[PDB]
Design a protein around this ligand. Sequence first.
Ligand SMILES: Cc1cc2nc3c(=O)[nH]c(=O)nc-3n(C[C@H](O)[C@H](O)[C@H](O)COP(=O)(O)OP(=O)(O)OC[C@H]3O[C@@H](n4cnc5c(N)ncnc54)[C@H](O)[C@@H]3O)c2cc1C
Ligand SMILES: Cc1cc2nc3c(=O)[nH]c(=O)nc-3n(C[C@H](O)[C@H](O)[C@H](O)COP(=O)(O)OP(=O)(O)OC[C@H]3O[C@@H](n4cnc5c(N)ncnc54)[C@H](O)[C@@H]3O)c2cc1C
Ligand SMILES: Cc1cc2nc3c(=O)[nH]c(=O)nc-3n(C[C@H](O)[C@H](O)[C@H](O)COP(=O)(O)OP(=O)(O)OC[C@H]3O[C@@H](n4cnc5c(N)ncnc54)[C@H](O)[C@@H]3O)c2cc1C
Ligand SMILES: Cc1cc2nc3c(=O)[nH]c(=O)nc-3n(C[C@H](O)[C@H](O)[C@H](O)COP(=O)(O)OP(=O)(O)OC[C@H]3O[C@@H](n4cnc5c(N)ncnc54)[C@H](O)[C@@H]3O)c2cc1C
Ligand SMILES: CC(=O)SCCNC(=O)CCNC(=O)[C@H](O)C(C)(C)COP(=O)(O)OP(=O)(O)OC[C@H]1O[C@@H](n2cnc3c(N)ncnc32)[C@H](O)[C@@H]1OP(=O)(O)O
Ligand SMILES: CC(=O)SCCNC(=O)CCNC(=O)[C@H](O)C(C)(C)COP(=O)(O)OP(=O)(O)OC[C@H]1O[C@@H](n2cnc3c(N)ncnc32)[C@H](O)[C@@H]1OP(=O)(O)O
Ligand SMILES: CC(=O)SCCNC(=O)CCNC(=O)[C@H](O)C(C)(C)COP(=O)(O)OP(=O)(O)OC[C@H]1O[C@@H](n2cnc3c(N)ncnc32)[C@H](O)[C@@H]1OP(=O)(O)O
Ligand SMILES: CC(=O)SCCNC(=O)CCNC(=O)[C@H](O)C(C)(C)COP(=O)(O)OP(=O)(O)OC[C@H]1O[C@@H](n2cnc3c(N)ncnc32)[C@H](O)[C@@H]1OP(=O)(O)O
Lengths: 381, 381, 381, 381
Amino acid sequence: FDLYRPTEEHEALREAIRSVAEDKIAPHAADVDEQSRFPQEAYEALRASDFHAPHVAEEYGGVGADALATCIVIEEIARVCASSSLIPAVNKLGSMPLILSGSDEVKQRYLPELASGEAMFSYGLSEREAGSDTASMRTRAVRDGDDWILNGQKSWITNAGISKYYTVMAVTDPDGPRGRNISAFVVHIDDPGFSFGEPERKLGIKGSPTRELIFDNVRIPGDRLVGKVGEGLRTALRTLDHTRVTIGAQAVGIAQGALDYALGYVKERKQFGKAIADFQGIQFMLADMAMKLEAARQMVYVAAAKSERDDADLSFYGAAAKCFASDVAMEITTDAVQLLGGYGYTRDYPVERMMRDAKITQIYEGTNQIQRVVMARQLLK
Amino acid sequence: FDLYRPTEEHEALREAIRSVAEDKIAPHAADVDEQSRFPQEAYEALRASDFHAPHVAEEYGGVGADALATCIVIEEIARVCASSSLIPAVNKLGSMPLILSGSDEVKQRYLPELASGEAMFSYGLSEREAGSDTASMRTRAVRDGDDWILNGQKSWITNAGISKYYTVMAVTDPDGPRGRNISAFVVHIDDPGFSFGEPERKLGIKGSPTRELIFDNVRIPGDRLVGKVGEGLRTALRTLDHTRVTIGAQAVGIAQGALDYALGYVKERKQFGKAIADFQGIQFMLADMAMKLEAARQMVYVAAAKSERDDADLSFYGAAAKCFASDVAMEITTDAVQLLGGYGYTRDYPVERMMRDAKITQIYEGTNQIQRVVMARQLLK
Amino acid sequence: FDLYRPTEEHEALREAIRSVAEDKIAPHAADVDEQSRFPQEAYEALRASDFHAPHVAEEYGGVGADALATCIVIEEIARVCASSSLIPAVNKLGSMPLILSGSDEVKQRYLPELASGEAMFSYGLSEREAGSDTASMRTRAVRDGDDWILNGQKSWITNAGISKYYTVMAVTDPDGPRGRNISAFVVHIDDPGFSFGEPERKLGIKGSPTRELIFDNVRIPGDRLVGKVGEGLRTALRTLDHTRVTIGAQAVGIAQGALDYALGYVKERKQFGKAIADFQGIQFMLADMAMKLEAARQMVYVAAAKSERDDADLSFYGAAAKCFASDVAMEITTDAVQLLGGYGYTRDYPVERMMRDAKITQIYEGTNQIQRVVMARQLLK
Amino acid sequence: FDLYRPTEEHEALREAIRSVAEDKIAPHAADVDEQSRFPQEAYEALRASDFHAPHVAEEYGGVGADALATCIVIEEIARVCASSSLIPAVNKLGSMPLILSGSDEVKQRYLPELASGEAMFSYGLSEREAGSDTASMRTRAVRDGDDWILNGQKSWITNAGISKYYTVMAVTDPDGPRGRNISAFVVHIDDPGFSFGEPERKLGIKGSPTRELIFDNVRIPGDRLVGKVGEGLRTALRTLDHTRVTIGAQAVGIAQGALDYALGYVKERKQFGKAIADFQGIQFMLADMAMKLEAARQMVYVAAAKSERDDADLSFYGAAAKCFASDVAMEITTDAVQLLGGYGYTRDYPVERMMRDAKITQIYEGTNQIQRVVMARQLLK
Ligand SMILES: Cc1cc2nc3c(=O)[nH]c(=O)nc-3n(C[C@H](O)[C@H](O)[C@H](O)COP(=O)(O)OP(=O)(O)OC[C@H]3O[C@@H](n4cnc5c(N)ncnc54)[C@H](O)[C@@H]3O)c2cc1C
Ligand SMILES: Cc1cc2nc3c(=O)[nH]c(=O)nc-3n(C[C@H](O)[C@H](O)[C@H](O)COP(=O)(O)OP(=O)(O)OC[C@H]3O[C@@H](n4cnc5c(N)ncnc54)[C@H](O)[C@@H]3O)c2cc1C
Ligand SMILES: Cc1cc2nc3c(=O)[nH]c(=O)nc-3n(C[C@H](O)[C@H](O)[C@H](O)COP(=O)(O)OP(=O)(O)OC[C@H]3O[C@@H](n4cnc5c(N)ncnc54)[C@H](O)[C@@H]3O)c2cc1C
Ligand SMILES: Cc1cc2nc3c(=O)[nH]c(=O)nc-3n(C[C@H](O)[C@H](O)[C@H](O)COP(=O)(O)OP(=O)(O)OC[C@H]3O[C@@H](n4cnc5c(N)ncnc54)[C@H](O)[C@@H]3O)c2cc1C
Ligand SMILES: CC(=O)SCCNC(=O)CCNC(=O)[C@H](O)C(C)(C)COP(=O)(O)OP(=O)(O)OC[C@H]1O[C@@H](n2cnc3c(N)ncnc32)[C@H](O)[C@@H]1OP(=O)(O)O
Ligand SMILES: CC(=O)SCCNC(=O)CCNC(=O)[C@H](O)C(C)(C)COP(=O)(O)OP(=O)(O)OC[C@H]1O[C@@H](n2cnc3c(N)ncnc32)[C@H](O)[C@@H]1OP(=O)(O)O
Ligand SMILES: CC(=O)SCCNC(=O)CCNC(=O)[C@H](O)C(C)(C)COP(=O)(O)OP(=O)(O)OC[C@H]1O[C@@H](n2cnc3c(N)ncnc32)[C@H](O)[C@@H]1OP(=O)(O)O
Ligand SMILES: CC(=O)SCCNC(=O)CCNC(=O)[C@H](O)C(C)(C)COP(=O)(O)OP(=O)(O)OC[C@H]1O[C@@H](n2cnc3c(N)ncnc32)[C@H](O)[C@@H]1OP(=O)(O)O
């Protein structure tokens, strides 16, 4: 009766990534956060064992991992270092427009490099004046001969400056129909006229660089185009249906690492002659954490399986899984800090970082408010 | 990729029970509640299509439906009439101690009658002074020759007076070790010295009779014994691991029928020139309802599959699924009443009954407080 | 230091109404609910001790109680019978348009009768197609000589059929400016062409009659007019600024009676060898109930004092106090049912009625959704 | 009708502290947090206008401000800089054992210095192995001639290293009765054998130093004793009844500054052609923030007035106000971050610091869990 559980191969993949995460990634998490620096140790351990971008097809030298497997990887990394979890998460986000809409030549040019881990990918959608409202973006791409000239800026780009390649969405016709006048392009770190802004000072995922892309007449070849002229936003949003699920998986992981730490702590700590775990009010809190986490985890796995089959209701299930899991992670991390008392408020324990990191999950890949707008559209048609 | 969904056979069973529920059961739900009377129409339609006790093995003339199938049946009935959903739910609860612990002869005597629907089952555990604290029960069974003599009372028995057979737990040794001095017996409606109390006046599931069993020197044969002397509480609690999941499935159904009604209503109703559904604050409420329901539904299906395999962690997952789904159903029904305004507060719409019925799901088969005690034990060992 | 408490005279008024409520009103509450019948015993005890309409000015034979005193009365009644609390609450709601906008002659005609308790008042604003959207009402009043002719219907009128007088809002010019084409009139129970609909079957406040007013060419004298032609909605909404606070006071009372009962119960009931109150998870629940109730109570008193002074920010504080206190009452009553276990789900204990009654407080005098619309307008200008 | 509001003198004090806070304190808040350094600018502006310790009696050169006035000061500072708010809050916490239990000579020695602002006070209760469980503390004070010798350690001391004087609680008889074998002493920064630990690295209130006190045979005169031998814990806990209210006032302030910023932001920011404030889902969020804040604020003022009169139920009201206001501040700050989107997650806006600072309010002066233990004791006796 193999209903409603991961396969044996998924559970073996879980032990393998857990093992890389606990030995190679976890030891460096406090320092990655404290110095706001890229988790280089984690990148190298993920690259050595093929967990840095597992979703890439075997045809390109990839692992060809399914959508649920990929979620388990991101979850198990996020359990110990949220910044590190963004290596596979943003590698998927940036590459997915190619995998969904790109020509065989574009795929063949870029995906092998991701597969071997010589290159990381970023995704450039958001701007200063168009975050949630992606259709109002102002970055322009103009034909010049067979070339494209890009002008404008993207905001908030994860792994910017480290990533070699940048999937960038830009207006290809300012008079074309709203939502359908935008195209996707691969931009290289060394393209002319392309700079980065100063790194953001953030609440959490501090080791993940977050920076503006600035495009000053960036000339790029015509073969940088991903899919069809004007179909770029369509591709960028179809991407978010799949990747929202991985941010759900991240939130679950962050929540799980916080619960693991709090549980271990309250079994050991004694006040009034008893373990903190022996107080029923604490038991009730722990039960609530565990029950909500498990509900979020299963809902993520249901959405991941939907992502793998491309089920017609993926839009609702990806928004619900991401929203739910991020809300739950926010509550659980806040409670994990609480359960350690004074100690939980200090950087000597990891729970305060986990609380800081959880808060991003409610904002990126579409604010939980936008998630609710998307869920309501699906219920009402 | 058949991960994290019901089988095609489960979806065909869903359309069949939905069809019986909408045509034969739903039309009578308001009257079942209003007159506090047994849903006889529903019993007859469930019996005619083999949904009154689907879990019984084919060996006994049953459907031999798996634990998830059984949950979908209870869910789809509970969508339209919570009182009716208790026909399969309490049939399982009452029969499960036989299925788990009874001899071939006991099973062969009672299960065929349930399978054909000539008999309903009830379960007698709780007492006046021992609800949550089952191990402190005072109903006694004393050997007399080969017979047993039962003395005491059970409280709160669902389908009492309608059920022909009663799985009753009683102390078989007042000096034996706590938790392990209790046995299970099948009691017939016509056994000597056995009466019922006056029906409870309840908030909801009003058509489901709820009554005390009174045992005044009830003489019954030695072959009424279910499993082993002293192992009765062990069996009764193992039962609740499986059946807690069906109360989760019930809560989901109640919540789903309330959301279906509220959605339909807010698309039609206009204030300030627009459909109520067009107000973003209402959209956010509806999204929250739908997202929480879906998280509860999936968590129930994960627990049901665990019930079918008898996974070692069933105890945690059944308590979490039941607790979560009942909490969520309470919130959603309260919000469904709200979304209809004045109309939602009247018995002309079904949402107020659905709110009243949802509240029981937080109390029976173990209060949500006891669910949290059980979940905390499992996390801490 | 007389800051942030009621006066000694308010505390003496509290003991007097508590005393009338516990002896004369409470004994009949279960029967008032069970038979859906008017609380006649309560009306007579409130009339005998001047608590049926205490807000009326001494100039009219009234008690001239301030807005906070009036809230304490409604609170202390609502502690034992929510239906009874609506005698002073709807007496205020119906009379307030006269007190605020009526001529000396209108006041002199109607308020003395309320003061002595020969007459109850109702308020007719809502319609079938205009609840929340009051400005879209369709009840019309047309001049004919010096008379007015009323045509249409009002929905959901509390104490209808018992009340002698009806403050009714109607369109006095279908071409006039939206919001400012409506007038208020006093309608007598015996006016020609005036009938009532069949009583609503409700979830709670079942002893309070709730019925449609039907106006079939109701001819009434020109001196029935309350304030100025077209200024009627302005008066009706100014009323709701004051009266929303009394529904806050009601919710507090309902919540307080539920907490009183649950506390008393969990001190007495024993499971597992201890009082239910000795379990820390229950302690935490009780603390949460008590803390939220007290926050709602104080916020109501702050709004009541604002109502008495007519502070400029009353609109925000009345909506916030009503919304908060009703949300809190809904949660507390739901938890009070839970704390009694099985017993809490039966009509032999009063907590289930208190839960049913609490739910109305989230809907009338402006849905909590409308309360949030009003609060957001005030924050944003 | 002067019910349920601050006096005119309280509102004039509010404008004066608001004015000092916005001009002299607010400009430095981001840098105080970013460099984890003491808010020296704020100390000097508070000292110049007599807001650094306003509660001290005029008899000692103080302002003699009442308990509500003192709460408004802490609230208005906390609106712009939570670290700065702890100057008056910890000055009160440290001095209160003297004000409540100290001799005229002890008061005359220490309070004038606080009043003029030449000295700050700290309070040393908590230890490594006794936080919540204060009665189990192990710091010892032993008589030697007329002197006392202190040995042990205190944990988590706010303003340690800056404060000149330290009210320290220590065991004065290890064989005496639990709870009643402890005394309070004033310790000077230059007493022999007294050192500080390395400053804690914290989530928030980073400019407030938090450090261990280490006592290595600290010899101090007999006249350092505050009140009576063995009555020290009694005094320390009576203190917390008053000071818990100021942490409520702090939380309110933090919440208010976060709401002020979010409101201002959502009126200006446009997506999809409209101000973010024009989206009803955002309106509902803002209403909820404002309504909960106001309920917390009033409940704090009610508790402050109780603190000023020393009402018999202060214990319940101080725990409820502190718990409620800190829970509400945690939710509101989390929502304020959310309402700014990406910007809210960066240190260029103050909302993320406000979220980090709010979390401490749930932990110090007694964890919200301990607050619930205290509230349940008061309800149940
Ligand atoms: C750490 C970090 C990393 C990021 N990485 C990337 C990346 O790699 N690639 C990329 O393209 N982007 C990235 N982003 C951008 C991120 O997804 C955007 O911030 C997000 O889409 C919100 O946009 P915004 O900040 O402009 O907020 P806005 O759109 O200005 O929204 C502000 C507030 O308004 C609310 N709101 C907006 N519209 C509505 C509506 N219609 N109804 C109700 N409420 C509404 C929002 O929920 C929010 O609370 C990143 C952001 C962060 C913080
Ligand atoms: C409609 C209905 C149908 C029922 N049908 C059946 C049936 O068919 N068969 C059957 O055997 N029983 C049946 N019951 C009984 C039901 O399961 C019991 O009410 C339930 O086990 C709770 O028992 P109680 O009412 O005695 O509450 P108590 O055990 O008295 O509990 C009272 C309160 O204390 C709390 N509490 C108790 N122990 C703890 C603890 N250790 N820690 C924290 N909080 C605690 C509970 O959660 C509850 O809130 C039914 C009940 C109802 C209402
Ligand atoms: C027991 C009872 C007694 C009553 N007594 C009286 C009385 O004495 N006098 C009287 O005049 N009326 C009375 N009423 C009417 C009551 O105040 C109305 O039901 C209320 O104003 C809501 O109107 P409605 O039922 O038409 O709901 P609708 O206005 O149809 O609202 C339906 C749903 O839409 C939501 N909604 C509506 N507008 C918005 C919006 N703009 N933004 C977001 N959500 C929105 C509402 O909150 C609600 O959830 C009574 C009602 C009841 C149930
Ligand atoms: C920034 C900061 C500043 C501080 N400043 C001062 C200061 O100036 N002076 C001072 O004396 N102290 C100070 N403290 C100490 C602070 O008040 C303590 O941390 C607090 O009393 C909790 O103690 P703890 O950390 O040892 O947690 P513990 O007591 O170990 O508690 C751990 C967890 O167990 C829970 N818990 C404990 N007992 C129970 C129970 N009986 N029932 C249920 N749950 C329980 C707690 O709520 C918490 O969630 C400060 C702390 C911080 C973080
Ligand atoms: C991970 C980060 O940090 S980066 C990404 C962060 N940003 C986001 O997640 C953006 C959040 N916003 C969005 O998802 C969208 O802008 C929304 C949901 C707000 C909708 O905005 P709208 O202006 O209403 O867009 P609309 O729904 O018209 O979509 C525009 C076009 O894309 C298409 N589209 C939208 N969603 C999808 C989808 N899931 N799959 C395929 N196409 C889609 C539309 O159908 C439309 O094309 P069409 O006109 O030919 O049908
Ligand atoms: C559906 C209704 O309306 S009817 C049922 C309603 N009532 C309930 O759900 C009862 C709620 N209460 C319970 O579940 C239990 O009484 C609990 C969880 C509170 C535990 O009570 P305790 O006194 O702590 O019982 P304890 O855990 O010692 O269990 C007693 C015995 O049953 C066994 N047992 C308990 N749970 C299980 C289980 N899930 N599977 C098998 N055996 C079990 C124990 O191991 C023990 O036997 P042992 O001593 O040989 O190990
Ligand atoms: C107790 C029950 O069961 S009965 C009452 C139940 N019904 C309600 O509570 C109704 C709920 N709805 C309302 O409060 C209103 O209809 C609202 C808040 C939704 C606003 O509706 P809108 O169409 O937006 O009305 P608007 O705000 O323009 O008000 C109409 C007029 O009344 C005035 N008005 C509104 N509120 C007030 C007030 N508090 N005081 C004085 N005048 C007011 C307006 O200023 C306007 O007159 P103007 O154009 O001369 O300024
Ligand atoms: C601000 C910070 O960061 S510093 C302060 C941080 N720490 C705290 O707030 C500590 C939290 N803990 C406490 O409040 C207490 O230790 C509690 C509530 C957990 C109670 O602990 P217990 O061991 O149960 O203490 P108990 O209630 O017996 O109190 C000990 C003694 O103090 C007395 N006492 C307790 N509360 C008070 C009070 N509010 N007023 C006066 N005396 C009091 C008791 O009556 C008792 O003396 P007694 O035996 O003569 O009656």
